[PDB]
Coordinates of C-alpha atoms and ligand atoms in Angstrom, one line a residue:
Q11 CA 0.0 0.0 0.0
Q12 CA 1.0 3.7 -0.6
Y13 CA 0.9 4.3 3.1
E14 CA 3.0 3.1 6.1
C15 CA 1.9 2.8 9.7
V16 CA 4.3 4.4 12.2
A17 CA 2.0 4.3 15.3
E18 CA -1.5 4.0 16.7
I19 CA -3.4 7.1 17.7
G20 CA -6.1 5.3 19.6
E21 CA -8.9 2.7 19.5
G22 CA -12.6 2.7 20.1
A23 CA -16.1 2.0 18.6
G25 CA -12.8 1.7 15.0
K26 CA -9.0 1.9 14.8
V27 CA -6.9 4.9 13.8
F28 CA -3.2 5.0 12.9
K29 CA -0.5 7.6 12.1
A30 CA 1.2 6.9 8.8
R31 CA 3.5 8.3 6.1
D32 CA 2.0 9.3 2.7
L33 CA 4.8 8.0 0.5
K34 CA 3.5 9.4 -2.8
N35 CA 3.0 12.9 -1.3
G36 CA 6.3 13.7 0.3
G37 CA 6.1 11.5 3.4
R38 CA 3.6 13.8 5.1
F39 CA 1.7 12.5 8.1
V40 CA -1.8 11.2 7.3
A41 CA -4.4 9.4 9.5
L42 CA -5.7 6.0 8.5
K43 CA -8.9 4.3 9.7
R44 CA -10.0 0.9 8.5
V45 CA -13.6 -0.1 9.1
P55 CA -24.4 -2.6 3.3
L56 CA -25.8 0.6 1.8
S57 CA -25.8 2.7 5.0
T58 CA -22.0 2.6 5.0
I59 CA -21.8 3.5 1.3
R60 CA -24.3 6.3 2.2
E61 CA -22.3 7.7 5.1
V62 CA -19.1 7.7 3.0
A63 CA -20.9 9.3 0.1
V64 CA -21.8 12.1 2.5
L65 CA -18.2 12.4 3.7
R66 CA -16.8 12.5 0.2
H67 CA -19.5 15.1 -0.5
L68 CA -18.7 17.2 2.6
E69 CA -15.0 17.2 1.5
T70 CA -15.7 19.1 -1.7
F71 CA -16.6 22.2 0.4
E72 CA -13.2 21.9 2.1
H73 CA -14.3 23.7 5.3
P74 CA -11.3 25.0 7.2
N75 CA -12.7 23.7 10.5
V76 CA -13.1 20.1 9.7
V77 CA -10.5 17.4 9.1
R78 CA -9.6 17.0 5.4
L79 CA -10.4 13.7 3.6
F80 CA -7.6 12.7 1.2
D81 CA -8.8 9.3 0.0
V82 CA -11.0 6.3 0.3
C83 CA -9.2 3.0 -0.3
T84 CA -11.3 0.2 -1.8
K93 CA -12.4 -3.9 4.8
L94 CA -12.4 -0.2 4.1
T95 CA -9.6 2.4 4.7
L96 CA -10.2 6.2 4.9
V97 CA -7.2 8.5 4.7
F98 CA -7.5 11.8 6.5
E99 CA -5.0 14.5 7.3
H100 CA -3.0 14.2 10.5
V101 CA -3.0 16.9 13.2
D102 CA -0.3 17.0 15.9
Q103 CA -2.7 17.0 18.9
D104 CA -6.2 17.1 20.2
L105 CA -7.9 19.6 22.5
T106 CA -7.2 17.4 25.5
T107 CA -3.5 17.4 25.2
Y108 CA -3.6 21.1 24.4
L109 CA -5.3 21.6 27.8
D110 CA -2.9 19.3 29.7
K111 CA 0.1 21.1 28.3
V112 CA -1.3 24.6 28.6
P113 CA 0.8 27.0 30.7
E114 CA -0.7 28.4 33.9
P115 CA -3.1 29.8 34.9
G116 CA -5.1 28.6 31.9
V117 CA -6.1 29.6 28.4
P118 CA -6.1 33.2 27.3
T119 CA -9.7 34.5 27.4
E120 CA -9.2 35.6 23.8
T121 CA -7.9 32.2 22.8
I122 CA -11.1 30.6 24.2
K123 CA -13.3 33.1 22.4
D124 CA -11.5 32.3 19.2
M125 CA -11.4 28.5 19.5
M126 CA -15.1 28.3 20.3
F127 CA -15.9 30.3 17.2
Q128 CA -13.9 27.9 15.0
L129 CA -15.7 25.1 16.8
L130 CA -19.1 26.6 16.2
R131 CA -18.2 27.2 12.5
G132 CA -17.7 23.5 11.7
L133 CA -20.7 22.6 13.8
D134 CA -23.0 24.9 11.8
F135 CA -21.3 23.7 8.6
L136 CA -22.2 20.1 9.7
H137 CA -25.7 21.0 10.8
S138 CA -26.4 22.9 7.6
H139 CA -25.7 19.7 5.8
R140 CA -27.8 17.7 8.3
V141 CA -24.9 15.8 9.8
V142 CA -25.0 15.3 13.6
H143 CA -21.6 14.6 15.2
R144 CA -23.3 12.7 18.1
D145 CA -20.2 12.3 20.2
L146 CA -18.4 15.6 20.4
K147 CA -15.7 15.5 23.1
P148 CA -12.3 17.2 23.3
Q149 CA -10.7 13.8 22.4
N150 CA -11.8 14.3 18.8
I151 CA -11.4 18.1 18.6
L152 CA -8.1 18.5 16.9
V153 CA -5.8 21.5 17.2
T154 CA -3.2 22.3 14.5
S155 CA 0.2 23.9 14.6
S156 CA -1.4 27.3 14.1
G157 CA -4.3 26.8 16.6
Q158 CA -6.9 25.9 14.0
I159 CA -9.7 23.8 15.4
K160 CA -10.6 20.8 13.2
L161 CA -13.5 18.4 14.0
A162 CA -12.8 14.7 13.6
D163 CA -14.6 11.4 14.1
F164 CA -18.1 12.0 12.6
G165 CA -20.6 10.6 10.1
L166 CA -19.7 7.0 10.6
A167 CA -21.3 4.1 12.6
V181 CA -16.5 5.4 27.8
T182 CA -17.5 9.0 28.3
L183 CA -21.0 10.3 28.9
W184 CA -19.5 13.5 30.4
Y185 CA -20.5 15.3 27.2
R186 CA -23.8 13.6 26.5
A187 CA -26.9 15.7 26.3
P188 CA -29.8 15.1 28.7
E189 CA -32.1 13.8 25.9
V190 CA -29.5 11.3 24.7
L191 CA -29.2 10.2 28.3
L192 CA -32.9 9.8 28.6
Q193 CA -32.9 8.3 25.1
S194 CA -35.6 10.6 23.6
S195 CA -34.3 13.0 21.0
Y196 CA -31.2 12.5 18.8
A197 CA -31.2 15.6 16.6
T198 CA -28.7 18.4 16.3
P199 CA -29.3 20.1 19.6
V200 CA -27.2 17.3 21.0
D201 CA -24.0 18.8 19.8
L202 CA -24.5 22.2 21.4
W203 CA -24.9 20.6 24.8
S204 CA -21.4 19.2 24.1
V205 CA -20.2 22.6 23.1
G206 CA -21.2 24.2 26.4
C207 CA -19.5 21.3 28.2
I208 CA -16.3 22.0 26.3
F209 CA -16.6 25.8 26.6
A210 CA -16.8 25.3 30.3
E211 CA -13.8 22.9 30.4
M212 CA -11.8 25.5 28.5
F213 CA -12.0 27.5 31.7
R214 CA -11.9 24.6 34.2
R215 CA -9.4 22.5 32.4
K216 CA -11.3 19.7 34.1
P217 CA -14.6 18.0 32.8
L218 CA -17.7 19.7 34.1
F219 CA -20.0 16.8 34.8
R220 CA -18.1 13.6 35.5
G221 CA -20.7 10.9 36.0
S222 CA -20.2 7.2 36.6
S223 CA -23.2 6.1 34.5
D224 CA -26.2 7.5 32.6
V225 CA -28.4 8.1 35.7
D226 CA -25.5 9.4 37.8
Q227 CA -24.6 11.6 34.8
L228 CA -28.1 13.0 34.6
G229 CA -28.0 13.8 38.3
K230 CA -24.7 15.7 38.0
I231 CA -26.3 17.9 35.3
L232 CA -29.4 18.7 37.2
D233 CA -27.5 19.5 40.4
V234 CA -26.2 22.6 38.5
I235 CA -28.8 23.8 36.0
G236 CA -31.8 22.9 38.2
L237 CA -34.9 20.8 37.8
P238 CA -36.5 21.7 34.5
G239 CA -40.2 22.7 34.1
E240 CA -42.6 19.7 34.0
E241 CA -43.3 20.2 30.3
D242 CA -39.6 20.3 29.6
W243 CA -39.3 16.6 30.5
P244 CA -39.8 14.5 27.4
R245 CA -42.7 12.0 27.6
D246 CA -42.5 8.2 27.4
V247 CA -39.0 7.9 28.9
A248 CA -38.2 5.3 31.5
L249 CA -36.8 8.1 33.7
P250 CA -39.4 10.4 35.2
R251 CA -38.7 14.0 36.5
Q252 CA -39.8 12.8 40.0
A253 CA -36.7 10.6 40.2
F254 CA -34.4 13.6 40.9
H255 CA -34.3 16.6 43.4
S258 CA -32.6 23.3 42.6
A259 CA -30.4 25.5 40.4
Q260 CA -26.9 26.6 41.2
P261 CA -25.1 29.8 40.0
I262 CA -22.6 29.2 37.2
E263 CA -19.8 31.5 38.3
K264 CA -19.0 29.0 41.0
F265 CA -18.1 26.0 38.8
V266 CA -16.8 28.3 36.1
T267 CA -14.7 31.3 37.2
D268 CA -13.5 34.1 34.8
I269 CA -16.6 33.6 32.7
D270 CA -18.0 37.0 31.6
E271 CA -21.7 37.9 31.4
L272 CA -21.6 37.3 27.6
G273 CA -19.8 34.0 28.2
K274 CA -22.3 33.1 31.0
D275 CA -25.5 34.0 28.9
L276 CA -24.3 32.0 25.9
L277 CA -23.1 29.1 28.0
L278 CA -26.6 29.0 29.6
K279 CA -28.3 28.8 26.2
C280 CA -26.1 25.8 25.2
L281 CA -27.0 23.9 28.3
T282 CA -30.8 24.5 28.2
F283 CA -32.4 21.2 29.3
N284 CA -35.0 21.5 26.5
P285 CA -33.5 20.8 23.0
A286 CA -36.1 23.1 21.4
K287 CA -35.1 26.0 23.6
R288 CA -31.4 25.3 23.3
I289 CA -29.5 27.6 21.0
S290 CA -28.1 26.5 17.5
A291 CA -24.6 26.9 16.1
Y292 CA -25.9 29.4 13.5
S293 CA -27.6 31.3 16.2
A294 CA -24.5 31.0 18.4
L295 CA -22.2 32.5 15.8
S296 CA -24.2 35.7 16.1
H297 CA -24.0 36.0 19.9
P298 CA -22.8 39.3 21.3
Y299 CA -19.9 37.4 23.0
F300 CA -18.3 37.2 19.6
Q301 CA -18.0 40.9 19.1
Ligands
LIG401 C1 0.6 10.5 23.5 N1 0.0 10.4 22.1 C2 -0.7 9.1 22.0 C3 -0.7 11.6 21.7 C4 -0.5 11.9 20.2 C5 -1.3 13.2 19.8 N2 -2.7 12.9 20.1 C6 -3.7 12.8 19.1 C7 -5.0 12.5 19.5 C8 -6.0 12.4 18.5 C9 -5.7 12.6 17.2 N3 -6.4 12.5 16.0 C10 -5.5 12.8 15.0 C11 -5.8 12.9 13.5 O1 -4.9 13.2 12.8 C12 -7.1 12.5 13.0 C13 -7.5 12.9 11.8 C14 -8.8 12.6 11.3 N4 -9.6 11.7 12.0 C15 -9.2 11.3 13.2 C16 -10.2 10.4 13.9 C17 -10.9 9.4 13.1 N5 -11.7 8.5 13.6 C18 -12.0 8.5 14.9 C19 -11.4 9.4 15.8 C20 -11.7 9.4 17.2 C21 -11.0 10.2 18.0 C22 -10.1 11.2 17.6 C23 -9.8 11.2 16.2 C24 -10.4 10.3 15.3 C25 -8.0 11.6 13.7 N6 -4.2 13.0 15.5 C26 -4.3 12.9 16.9 N7 -3.3 13.0 17.8 C27 -3.0 12.7 21.5 C28 -2.2 11.5 22.0

């Protein structure tokens, strides 16, 4: 094959490797090796590539079980936070990274792709500080799961803005905001902070009823340095109700990004 594995990046639900692209100057690429639904998902990927959005990982090739060649990025958001000098991330650097993050999200929503598992472990940061979304559009941590996914009720795009707020926060905290040991625990951790939602905000026909939990806390506690504009925006990303939750397109126009 034209490529040559030099290491593994990680494994999960598939397998991703770091390699050399021998035909293109020995640059680093990323190889993943994984039925119409599959053909379908790849058709979308190939399609999304055409637009070449700066805030999503480039697709270089699809080898004919199935190998997908993407670009390689030196690090993810997680190692960027581990290795970040004290006492954190420059307010301005957060404001910028979030924007780039929201850009690719709107780009993905606008084409009706839902990431479904957006966590800092697949948010890639390049040499220049360019955010690039990885690990999407193909078939451990619930800390970034949205309430409705936890309740197993709605699976639409509002899911990924819940994750955005969770990441937004962590960019201040440098530690995950809600660390739960399981789906019920997780759901608890969330409601301890945002407060019990209105009774009509609980989706119907879900095994978990509103009565199985027990008041809202102020946000500046768990997240310090956050401005009013950060606060307000962050609150509309973590609205319990997916219909009341903000959207990427709507987020891009928040006063916070002025
Ligand atoms: C200490 N060592 C182990 C550190 C080396 C630097 N580092 C990373 C981490 C993630 C990284 N992704 C990448 C990529 O280039 C890349 C490009 C396109 N798609 C993916 C991708 C595809 N499918 C599923 C995925 C699931 C999660 C994340 C990415 C996925 C990855 N390079 C990374 N380098 C941290 C550990």
